[PDB]
Coordinates of N, CA, C and O in Angstrom, one line a residue:
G1 N 116.5 108.3 129.8 CA 117.4 107.9 130.5 C 117.9 107.1 131.3 O 117.9 105.9 130.8
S2 N 118.5 107.1 132.0 CA 119.4 105.8 133.1 C 119.7 104.8 131.9 O 119.8 103.5 131.9
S3 N 120.5 104.8 131.1 CA 121.2 104.0 130.0 C 122.7 104.2 129.8 O 123.6 105.4 130.6
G4 N 123.2 102.9 129.9 CA 124.4 102.6 130.0 C 125.2 103.8 129.1 O 124.8 105.1 128.3
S5 N 126.2 103.8 128.4 CA 126.9 104.2 128.1 C 128.3 103.4 126.7 O 129.0 103.1 127.7
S6 N 128.0 103.3 125.4 CA 129.0 102.0 124.9 C 129.3 102.5 123.3 O 128.3 103.7 122.7
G7 N 130.5 102.7 122.4 CA 130.6 103.3 121.1 C 131.5 102.2 120.3 O 132.4 101.6 121.3
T8 N 131.6 102.2 119.2 CA 132.4 101.1 118.6 C 132.1 101.3 117.2 O 130.9 101.5 116.7
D9 N 132.8 100.2 116.1 CA 132.6 101.0 114.4 C 131.3 100.2 114.4 O 131.8 98.5 113.3
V10 N 130.4 100.5 114.1 CA 129.0 100.1 113.9 C 128.7 100.6 113.0 O 128.6 101.8 112.8
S11 N 128.0 100.2 111.8 CA 127.2 100.7 110.4 C 125.4 100.1 110.5 O 125.5 100.8 111.0
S12 N 125.4 99.6 110.8 CA 124.1 98.8 111.0 C 123.5 98.0 112.1 O 124.3 96.4 112.0
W13 N 123.1 98.4 112.6 CA 123.2 97.5 114.1 C 122.2 96.1 113.8 O 122.1 95.4 114.6
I14 N 121.4 96.7 112.8 CA 119.7 95.9 113.0 C 120.5 94.6 111.6 O 120.7 94.8 110.6
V15 N 121.0 93.7 111.7 CA 121.8 92.3 111.0 C 120.0 92.1 109.8 O 120.4 91.8 108.6
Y16 N 119.3 92.1 111.1 CA 117.9 90.8 110.7 C 116.8 90.8 111.3 O 116.7 91.3 112.7
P17 N 115.5 91.9 110.2 CA 115.7 91.4 108.8 C 116.1 92.2 107.9 O 116.8 93.6 108.8
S18 N 116.2 92.6 106.7 CA 117.1 93.8 105.9 C 115.6 93.8 105.5 O 116.1 94.6 103.8
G19 N 115.1 95.0 106.2 CA 114.6 96.1 105.1 C 112.6 95.2 106.6 O 112.8 95.3 107.1
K20 N 111.8 95.2 105.6 CA 110.4 96.1 105.5 C 110.0 94.4 106.0 O 110.0 93.4 105.3
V21 N 108.7 94.4 106.8 CA 107.9 92.7 107.6 C 106.7 92.9 107.2 O 106.5 93.9 108.0
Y22 N 106.2 91.7 106.1 CA 104.6 91.9 106.9 C 104.2 90.5 107.2 O 104.3 89.2 106.8
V23 N 103.9 90.8 108.4 CA 103.7 89.4 109.0 C 101.4 89.4 109.6 O 101.3 90.8 110.4
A24 N 100.9 88.6 109.9 CA 99.5 88.4 109.1 C 99.1 87.9 110.3 O 99.4 86.9 110.5
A25 N 98.7 88.5 111.8 CA 97.9 87.7 112.7 C 96.5 87.4 113.0 O 95.6 88.8 112.5
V26 N 96.2 87.1 113.8 CA 94.7 86.6 114.0 C 94.4 86.7 115.4 O 94.8 87.6 116.8
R27 N 92.9 87.2 116.3 CA 92.2 88.2 117.4 C 93.1 86.5 118.7 O 92.9 85.5 118.1
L28 N 94.1 87.6 118.9 CA 94.2 86.4 120.0 C 95.3 85.4 119.7 O 94.9 84.1 119.7
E29 N 96.2 85.7 118.5 CA 97.3 85.0 118.0 C 98.2 84.7 118.2 O 98.5 85.4 118.9
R30 N 99.4 83.9 118.4 CA 100.6 83.5 118.7 C 101.3 83.5 117.5 O 101.4 82.7 116.8
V31 N 101.8 85.7 117.6 CA 102.9 85.6 116.5 C 104.2 85.8 117.0 O 104.7 85.3 118.3
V32 N 105.1 85.2 116.6 CA 106.9 85.3 116.8 C 107.5 86.2 115.8 O 107.7 85.5 114.4
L33 N 107.9 87.4 116.3 CA 108.9 88.4 115.4 C 110.5 87.7 115.5 O 110.9 87.8 116.2
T34 N 110.9 88.1 114.3 CA 112.5 87.5 113.6 C 113.2 88.8 114.3 O 113.4 89.0 113.4
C35 N 113.8 89.3 115.0 CA 115.4 89.8 114.9 C 116.4 89.9 115.5 O 116.1 89.6 116.8
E36 N 117.9 90.5 114.3 CA 118.8 89.4 114.8 C 119.6 91.1 114.9 O 119.1 92.4 114.6
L37 N 120.5 90.3 115.5 CA 122.0 91.7 115.9 C 122.8 90.8 115.4 O 123.3 90.4 115.5
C38 N 123.7 92.9 115.1 CA 125.1 92.1 115.6 C 126.4 91.7 116.2 O 127.0 91.8 116.2
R39 N 125.1 92.2 117.6 CA 126.0 92.2 118.7 C 125.3 91.1 120.1 O 124.0 91.7 120.1
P40 N 125.6 90.6 120.5 CA 125.4 89.3 121.7 C 124.2 91.0 122.6 O 123.5 90.7 123.3
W41 N 125.4 91.8 123.3 CA 125.3 92.3 124.0 C 124.6 93.5 123.6 O 124.6 94.6 124.3
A42 N 123.8 93.6 122.9 CA 122.9 94.6 121.6 C 121.5 94.5 122.2 O 120.9 93.8 122.0
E43 N 121.7 95.3 122.8 CA 120.1 95.3 123.6 C 119.0 96.8 123.0 O 119.8 97.6 121.9
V44 N 118.5 95.6 122.5 CA 117.2 96.1 121.5 C 116.1 96.8 121.9 O 115.4 96.6 123.3
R45 N 115.0 97.6 122.1 CA 113.6 98.4 122.3 C 113.1 97.9 121.4 O 113.1 99.5 119.9
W46 N 111.8 97.7 121.3 CA 110.4 97.7 120.5 C 109.6 99.2 120.5 O 109.2 99.6 121.7
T47 N 109.1 99.8 119.8 CA 108.4 101.4 119.7 C 107.3 101.2 118.6 O 107.1 100.5 118.1
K48 N 105.8 101.4 119.2 CA 104.3 101.0 118.4 C 103.9 102.9 118.9 O 103.2 103.0 119.9
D49 N 104.6 103.1 117.6 CA 104.0 103.9 117.0 C 104.4 105.5 117.9 O 103.9 106.6 118.4
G50 N 105.0 105.3 117.8 CA 106.0 106.3 118.7 C 107.0 105.8 120.1 O 108.1 106.2 120.4
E51 N 105.9 105.2 121.0 CA 106.4 104.7 122.2 C 107.1 103.6 121.9 O 106.7 102.5 121.7
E52 N 107.6 103.7 123.6 CA 107.8 102.4 123.5 C 106.9 100.9 124.3 O 106.0 101.4 125.1
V53 N 107.0 99.7 123.3 CA 106.7 98.7 124.2 C 106.5 98.4 125.5 O 108.1 98.5 125.9
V54 N 106.1 97.8 125.6 CA 105.4 97.8 127.8 C 105.7 96.1 128.0 O 104.2 95.9 127.7
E55 N 106.0 95.6 128.9 CA 106.0 94.0 129.0 C 104.2 94.0 130.0 O 104.2 95.0 130.6
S56 N 103.6 92.9 129.4 CA 102.0 92.6 130.0 C 102.1 91.3 129.6 O 102.6 90.5 128.8
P57 N 101.1 90.7 130.5 CA 100.3 89.2 130.3 C 100.2 88.9 128.3 O 99.4 88.4 128.3
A58 N 99.9 89.7 127.6 CA 99.9 90.0 126.2 C 100.6 90.4 125.3 O 100.5 89.8 124.2
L59 N 102.1 90.0 126.3 CA 102.7 90.7 125.2 C 103.9 90.1 125.9 O 105.2 90.8 126.8
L60 N 104.6 89.2 125.3 CA 105.8 88.7 125.8 C 107.2 88.5 125.4 O 107.2 88.8 123.8
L61 N 108.2 89.4 125.4 CA 109.1 89.8 124.8 C 110.4 88.7 125.4 O 111.4 88.2 126.3
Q62 N 110.9 87.8 123.4 CA 111.5 87.0 124.3 C 112.9 87.2 123.5 O 113.0 88.9 122.5
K63 N 114.2 86.8 124.1 CA 115.5 86.8 124.0 C 116.7 86.0 123.2 O 116.9 85.6 124.4
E64 N 117.0 85.2 122.6 CA 118.2 84.7 122.1 C 119.5 85.3 122.3 O 119.5 86.7 122.7
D65 N 120.3 84.2 122.2 CA 121.8 84.6 122.4 C 122.3 85.7 122.2 O 122.3 87.3 122.4
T66 N 121.7 86.2 120.2 CA 123.0 86.9 119.8 C 121.7 88.0 118.4 O 121.4 88.5 118.0
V67 N 120.3 86.9 119.1 CA 118.9 87.4 118.1 C 118.2 87.4 119.2 O 117.6 86.2 119.7
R68 N 117.1 88.0 118.9 CA 115.5 88.3 119.8 C 114.3 88.5 119.1 O 114.0 88.5 117.4
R69 N 113.3 88.4 119.5 CA 111.7 87.8 119.5 C 111.4 88.4 120.0 O 111.0 88.0 121.5
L70 N 109.4 88.3 119.6 CA 108.5 89.2 120.3 C 107.9 88.4 120.6 O 107.4 88.0 119.4
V71 N 107.0 86.9 121.1 CA 106.2 86.7 121.0 C 104.9 87.2 121.6 O 105.3 88.3 123.2
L72 N 103.6 87.5 121.7 CA 102.3 87.5 121.7 C 101.7 86.2 121.9 O 101.1 85.8 121.2
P73 N 101.2 86.0 122.9 CA 100.2 84.8 123.4 C 99.2 85.1 123.3 O 98.2 84.4 123.5
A74 N 98.6 86.5 123.4 CA 97.3 86.8 123.2 C 97.5 88.5 122.2 O 97.2 89.1 123.3
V75 N 96.8 89.1 121.3 CA 97.2 90.2 120.6 C 95.6 90.5 120.4 O 94.3 89.6 120.8
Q76 N 95.1 91.4 120.0 CA 93.9 92.4 119.1 C 93.6 93.0 118.3 O 95.1 93.9 118.2
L77 N 93.2 93.3 117.7 CA 92.8 94.2 116.4 C 93.4 95.4 117.1 O 93.6 95.5 115.5
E78 N 93.3 96.0 118.2 CA 94.0 97.4 118.9 C 95.2 96.5 118.1 O 96.1 98.3 117.9
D79 N 96.0 95.7 118.9 CA 97.0 96.0 118.2 C 97.6 96.1 117.0 O 98.8 96.7 117.0
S80 N 96.8 95.5 116.0 CA 97.4 95.9 114.9 C 97.5 97.2 114.1 O 96.7 98.1 114.5
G81 N 99.0 97.4 113.7 CA 99.4 98.4 113.5 C 101.4 98.5 112.8 O 101.1 97.8 112.0
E82 N 102.1 99.2 113.3 CA 103.1 99.3 113.4 C 104.6 99.3 113.9 O 104.7 99.9 115.1
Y83 N 105.0 97.7 114.0 CA 105.8 97.5 115.6 C 107.7 98.1 114.4 O 108.3 97.2 113.5
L84 N 108.1 98.8 115.4 CA 109.5 99.3 114.4 C 110.3 98.7 116.7 O 109.5 99.7 117.2
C85 N 110.8 98.5 116.0 CA 112.3 98.0 116.4 C 113.0 98.9 116.8 O 114.1 98.5 115.4
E86 N 113.0 100.3 117.6 CA 115.0 100.3 117.5 C 115.6 100.2 118.9 O 115.5 99.5 120.0
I87 N 116.8 100.7 118.5 CA 118.4 99.6 118.5 C 118.8 100.5 119.5 O 119.1 100.7 120.4
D88 N 119.2 101.4 118.1 CA 120.5 102.7 118.8 C 120.2 103.9 117.2 O 119.7 104.9 118.6
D89 N 120.5 104.1 117.0 CA 119.7 105.1 115.2 C 119.2 104.6 114.3 O 118.7 105.0 113.7
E90 N 119.1 103.1 114.6 CA 118.3 102.5 113.1 C 116.8 101.9 114.0 O 116.7 101.2 115.2
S91 N 116.0 101.5 113.0 CA 114.8 100.3 113.3 C 114.9 99.9 112.7 O 114.9 100.0 111.4
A92 N 113.6 98.4 112.7 CA 112.6 97.9 111.9 C 111.7 97.9 112.4 O 111.1 98.4 113.0
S93 N 111.8 97.5 111.4 CA 109.3 98.0 110.1 C 109.2 96.9 110.4 O 109.9 95.5 109.8
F94 N 108.4 96.7 111.2 CA 107.6 94.6 111.9 C 106.5 95.1 111.5 O 105.6 96.1 112.4
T95 N 105.4 94.8 110.4 CA 103.9 95.1 110.2 C 103.3 94.0 110.8 O 103.5 92.8 110.1
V96 N 102.1 94.0 111.9 CA 101.4 93.1 111.9 C 100.0 93.5 112.2 O 99.1 94.2 113.3
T97 N 99.6 92.9 111.1 CA 98.2 93.1 111.1 C 97.0 92.2 111.5 O 97.4 90.5 110.8
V98 N 96.5 92.6 112.3 CA 95.3 91.2 113.0 C 94.0 91.1 112.1 O 93.5 93.4 112.7
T99 N 93.1 90.0 112.5 CA 91.5 90.4 111.6 C 91.1 89.5 112.6 O 91.7 88.5 113.2
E100 N 89.9 89.1 112.1 CA 88.7 88.2 112.4 C 88.8 87.5 112.4 O 89.0 87.0 111.3
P101 N 89.2 86.4 113.6 CA 89.3 84.2 113.3 C 88.2 83.9 112.1 O 87.3 84.5 112.5
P102 N 88.4 82.4 111.9 CA 87.1 82.1 111.4 C 86.2 81.7 112.4 O 86.5 81.7 113.8
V103 N 85.1 80.9 111.5 CA 84.3 81.2 112.0 C 84.2 79.7 113.4 O 85.1 78.5 113.2
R104 N 83.9 80.2 115.0 CA 84.6 78.5 115.9 C 83.0 79.2 116.7 O 83.0 77.6 117.5
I105 N 82.0 79.6 117.1 CA 81.2 79.3 117.9 C 80.5 78.6 117.6 O 79.3 79.3 116.7
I106 N 80.0 77.4 117.8 CA 79.3 76.6 118.0 C 78.8 75.6 118.7 O 78.9 75.2 119.8
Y107 N 76.9 76.2 118.5 CA 76.4 76.0 119.7 C 75.3 75.0 119.2 O 74.8 75.1 118.5
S108 N 75.5 73.6 119.9 CA 74.7 72.6 119.8 C 73.1 71.9 120.9 O 73.3 72.1 121.7
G109 N 72.5 71.9 120.8 CA 71.0 71.2 121.7 C 69.7 70.2 121.5 O 69.0 71.4 119.9
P110 N 68.9 70.1 121.5 CA 67.8 69.5 121.5 C 67.0 71.0 122.1 O 66.3 71.5 123.6
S111 N 66.2 72.0 121.1 CA 65.9 73.3 121.2 C 64.2 72.3 121.7 O 63.3 71.5 121.3
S112 N 64.4 73.0 122.8 CA 62.8 73.2 123.5 C 62.1 73.2 123.6 O 61.7 74.6 123.1
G113 N 60.7 73.0 123.5 CA 59.4 73.1 122.8 C 59.7 74.5 122.2 O 59.5 74.7 121.5

């Protein structure tokens, strides 16, 4: 609800990408989704598992002139799923699989006793 009301001779709101897209991310990785539109004032909405994504300190929604993008300063293995970007009547498929990062924890020191 609480939505405006517009209309025009439009075929496919989602100008890009043109199909399914696969994206591989890592725990607490910085990803950047690319989703352009055939309209500047065209408002879009990202949905995760049927539900709509909500702004948060772990999910940043970027918006360009005529193209939109979803940046995540910190992702989680749980986030890994199916990102569907819906605008009006169409939706864009965005696969974002998150896995465990490479060895990082490195502890060293003089073994006492």
